[PDB]
Amino acid sequence: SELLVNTKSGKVMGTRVPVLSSHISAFLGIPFAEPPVGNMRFRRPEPKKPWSGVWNASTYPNNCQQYVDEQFPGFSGSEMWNPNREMSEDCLYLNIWVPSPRPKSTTVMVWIYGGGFYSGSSTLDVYNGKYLAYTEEVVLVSLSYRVGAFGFLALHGSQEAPGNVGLLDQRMALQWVHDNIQFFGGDPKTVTIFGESAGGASVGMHILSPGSRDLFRRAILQSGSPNCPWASVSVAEGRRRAVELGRNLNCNLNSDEELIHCLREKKPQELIDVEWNVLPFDSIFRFSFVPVIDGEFFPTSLESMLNSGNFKKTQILLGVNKDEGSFFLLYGAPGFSKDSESKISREDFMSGVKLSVPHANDLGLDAVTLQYTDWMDDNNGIKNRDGLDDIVGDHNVICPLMHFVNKYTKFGNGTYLYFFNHRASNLVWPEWMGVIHGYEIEFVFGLPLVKELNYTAEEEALSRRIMHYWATFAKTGNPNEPHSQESKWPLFTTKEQKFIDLNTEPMKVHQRLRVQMCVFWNQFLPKLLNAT
Amino acid sequence: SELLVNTKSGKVMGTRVPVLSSHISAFLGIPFAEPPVGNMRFRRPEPKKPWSGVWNASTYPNNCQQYVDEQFPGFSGSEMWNPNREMSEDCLYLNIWVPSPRPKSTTVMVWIYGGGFYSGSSTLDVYNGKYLAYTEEVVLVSLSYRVGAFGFLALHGSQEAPGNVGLLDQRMALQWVHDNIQFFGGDPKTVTIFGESAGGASVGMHILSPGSRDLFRRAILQSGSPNCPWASVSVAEGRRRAVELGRNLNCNLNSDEELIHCLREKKPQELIDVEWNVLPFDSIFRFSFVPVIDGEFFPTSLESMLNSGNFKKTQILLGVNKDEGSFFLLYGAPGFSKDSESKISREDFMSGVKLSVPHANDLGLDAVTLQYTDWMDDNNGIKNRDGLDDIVGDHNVICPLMHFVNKYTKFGNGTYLYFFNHRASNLVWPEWMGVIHGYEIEFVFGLPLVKELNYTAEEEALSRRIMHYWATFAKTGNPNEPHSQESKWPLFTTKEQKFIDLNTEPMKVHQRLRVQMCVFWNQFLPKLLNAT
Numbered sequence A, B: 001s002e003l004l005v006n007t008k009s010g011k012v013m014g015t016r017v018p019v020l021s022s023h024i025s026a027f028l029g030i031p032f033a034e035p036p037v038g039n040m041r042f043r044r045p046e047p048k049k050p051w052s053g054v055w056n057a058s059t060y061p062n063n064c065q066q067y068v069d070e071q072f073p074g075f076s077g078s079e080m081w082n083p084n085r086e087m088s089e090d091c092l093y094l095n096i097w098v099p100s101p102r103p104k105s106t107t108v109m110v111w112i113y114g115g116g117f118y119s120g121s122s123t124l125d126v127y128n129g130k131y132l133a134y135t136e137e138v139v140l141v142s143l144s145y146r147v148g149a150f151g152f153l154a155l156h157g158s159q160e161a162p163g164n165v166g167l168l169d170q171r172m173a174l175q176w177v178h179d180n181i182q183f184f185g186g187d188p189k190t191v192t193i194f195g196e197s198a199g200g201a202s203v204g205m206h207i208l209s210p211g212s213r214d215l216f217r218r219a220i221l222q223s224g225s226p227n228c229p230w231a232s233v234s235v236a237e238g239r240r241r242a243v244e245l246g247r248n249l250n251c252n253l254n255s256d257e258e259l260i261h262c263l264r265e266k267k268p269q270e271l272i273d274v275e276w277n278v279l280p281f282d283s284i285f286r287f288s289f290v291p292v293i294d295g296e297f298f299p300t301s302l303e304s305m306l307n308s309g310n311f312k313k314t315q316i317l318l319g320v321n322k323d324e325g326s327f328f329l330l331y332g333a334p335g336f337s338k339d340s341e342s343k344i345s346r347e348d349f350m351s352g353v354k355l356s357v358p359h360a361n362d363l364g365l366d367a368v369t370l371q372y373t374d375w376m377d378d379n380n381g382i383k384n385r386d387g388l389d390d391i392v393g394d395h396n397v398i399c400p401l402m403h404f405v406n407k408y409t410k411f412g413n414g415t416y417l418y419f420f421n422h423r424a425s426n427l428v429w430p431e432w433m434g435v436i437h438g439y440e441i442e443f444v445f446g447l448p449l450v451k452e453l454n455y456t457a458e459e460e461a462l463s464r465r466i467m468h469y470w471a472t473f474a475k476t477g478n479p480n481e482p483h484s485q486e487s488k489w490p491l492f493t494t495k496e497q498k499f500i501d502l503n504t505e506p507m508k509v510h511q512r513l514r515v516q517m518c519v520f521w522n523q524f525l526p527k528l529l530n531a532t
């Protein structure tokens, strides 16, 4: 009845789940695409053919095939991001949480997981949608999409491995929401897509792509934007990395058809095992198989589309965390450790900036170094560590996003910008990592509202504020409730460039988020590298 | 008797001058060279031929031919720098102040005036040597040398206008001191040369030049150093500017001999009137006729001599003023005024950096701008004004001197570094100009001891401390009197890089004078300009 829904593709049976003191409806693992397996590996997705009978949607689906982190086995701080279900190429499913009783036609939010386009799962604990759907009375969807070579191997000109098929996976789930969410009590005219990291970049890519714009109303971008340096490659570089993946696996490289035929014969773990080997440089915050600027999903270069206003004009809400860089330094740069303060020598600092800006020449590396070194105190291990942290986060997340913010606001219909700088009281990662890449998500999804997770009362109130900002923005295009007496999150404007902090303290309005370093990263350094 | 002195060139009769409550002997206007007139214009100096009878040395000599500032007619702040005697090409004379009674063989200090190599006189009120000679019981000499085209027209390969002849004028006065100062009670084995601005660059150039090294014992450099970007040119640029001087005056330009012959026919003021026209760029802190890197007075490039230790190894004392740049901005940059606070617009700020770094490409101008602009507050007219002030002083005086200081200290026998930042109580220049280029000289020469000049008691104390540091350094190679109870000015070392402030407060020791900006000016910007 409430749990039995007839969709355009067939019937689905959800399940009644507890949430806090109440209950909500959950429809877990609904298929939206044909399994992209066998001869369909690397191909564009195809709509799921209708089924007879009742699809049992009481259970999370498989996760897509991906690299699995084993750096800290058993450590909750890293395991919380690993697949918590069996991995399978049969992984194109979505999950829906619907308030009980079913609303008539309420706001829809569609979550797009991040993970550098090489990892991510819709089924992670931290993406459990019941708290946001319950508390804010929205219909919450989480989609999935192929990652790694399965989603983004790009042999442009081939229609068997064209590239971007993971983005087309996301679009197909959006098309499914457009076509079916009304049967779950959602309004298909009021859909907000939101995501973090590669999911935030993805959200911005759908803003850019003509083939995506009519499938959602407005957008939220968390710690990611479509113009980030790690988020796309040229057709030439995607082709180089695909050929190099074949070479690592002794594939016939004579032609696209032969290379593709060889790669379709490999077991999924065989591709994953060599995935990192195709990167052109020793680097951090760089991923092998990512969206390709192809002329079809993206009509022209991202910058030209941004300059001409060739993108969906709507309202956006977006922001960054204080220490986006620490996670990537922990995993890939010398001198960093989970169990120490990680004071960074001068030698390791220099090694770090080379890894963080792998595409720079020697003059470029000197410019970065000078911009972030205190030459009154250059042997300070704390300042060297924090300076590397700022380099990674500024270059890869904050300044690309601020470039997007400024370009979008010229043509958009409303921008709201945040800076999340709260370090959770129960964080299991050490102090030096600060406010980590990914660790705003738990507040967005209302995990502080769960008593046994041991957040403070102030953190529950912060999560509730953030959920209400997100859902109110999704409903109306404005995170603020009218006639309310709390402080108002102001519009970001071209002239005043205002943003807010998100933390447990009363709201402060600031202007020009990290403007000094982002002039360096968005204007001077690109000019220097283009001139040298 | 006391006033009658027989020198190797002939007898001189000095004069008894009052000084504070006492008297000392002055020998004013002694010739040390043949008049460099007629066919000797642009030529190396020749020793003064011996004369019969008594040279009346009771009167200041003429000043050399030079551009005369008429920007603020009658204003004491600018006219204190103008020739206070008749100008003449017959100007190669020196002045001596001798304690009374005549010492047996005491320390000698020789003053070399600055003025951009285009102006300067030994006879200015602020260079009056009687206060320092009386108070510190030294024999004080001030020399003269040809400036502008008359001293530094350079047509390399010609022996008629070889270049650097003003530096040879200085050398010949030093040779005269070496041969004759014993007859005035001075010890030719304890001669300190000191100078400000171009005089300070000159001092450093005598340290470098083999033909100068044996004519003095140690050296003091004030707000100038031999490697300053304004202090020398290549033989090719020197030749180009000499040929452009001829073109401005309708000279035959077919050979050195005809060009030189044409220029020797001109009245002195005809050369002066077109002097500034030969500069390659619109600029500030750039001067037309300066030393040439010639392979003779300087064996190789100044940077290679500094790197190899090819210079005199002795003790040096040197330093800079807090606002070296303001005088040059007042006279040559848009938005600056003697009679206003000179808040600088963004447009005028950008005009100023182009004038301040005239040799930079657009990439280099962007680099300077970013290094000195607060992009949270870029329309702040005070920050824009002070930033341009810092650019001029850092680029032209402070960071060249710090490069010299660090290179020299690797090989020398003792370095003492100061930062003069006292703004005089009776300054006639506006407050935005701060601590001006040239305005430590009056403290070095003891003017605050003259009650009529209306300095404070603390400024008299400051002048007495500085005169004692300078003379004790001249005497011993160390500004400090060991066994005394005063705060000790420490050696500058390669590792610790210590320096003191000079002002009316108790002594503060600091380290790494303006190290952050000087890394930009001495390492990064030249590498950027060399790549592009």
Ligand SMILES: COc1cc(CNC(=O)CCCCCCNc2c3c(nc4cc(Cl)ccc24)C[C@H]2C=C(C)C[C@@H]3C2)ccc1O
Pocket (backbone or CB within 6 Å): A068, A069, A077, A078, A081, A082, A114, A115, A116, A119, A197, A198, A276, A283, A327, A331, A332, A333, A429, A436, A437, A438
């Ligand atoms: C070849 O280069 C390297 C490759 C690797 C392989 N390992 C990795 O890239 C990182 C391990 C896989 C992802 C770890 C779990 N994912 C996390 C994620 C996030 N934040 C994390 C924060 C911390 Cl402190 C720890 C893990 C986070 C936030 C989101 C973004 C990403 C990219 C993955 C995932 C979701 C390690 C070192 C290297 O030098």
Ligand SMILES: COc1cc(CNC(=O)CCCCCCNc2c3c(nc4cc(Cl)ccc24)C[C@H]2C=C(C)C[C@@H]3C2)ccc1O
Pocket (backbone or CB within 6 Å): B068, B069, B077, B078, B081, B114, B115, B116, B119, B197, B198, B276, B283, B284, B327, B331, B332, B333, B429, B436, B437, B438
């Ligand atoms: C080619 O560019 C320009 C050229 C000129 C030509 N005029 C000048 O450069 C100024 C002419 C000399 C007038 C000042 C010389 N005296 C000063 C001197 C010093 N400090 C001064 C400080 C102030 Cl506030 C005022 C004068 C000072 C310190 C010493 C150093 C110099 C260069 C000359 C003299 C001694 C004017 C505007 C321009 O844009």
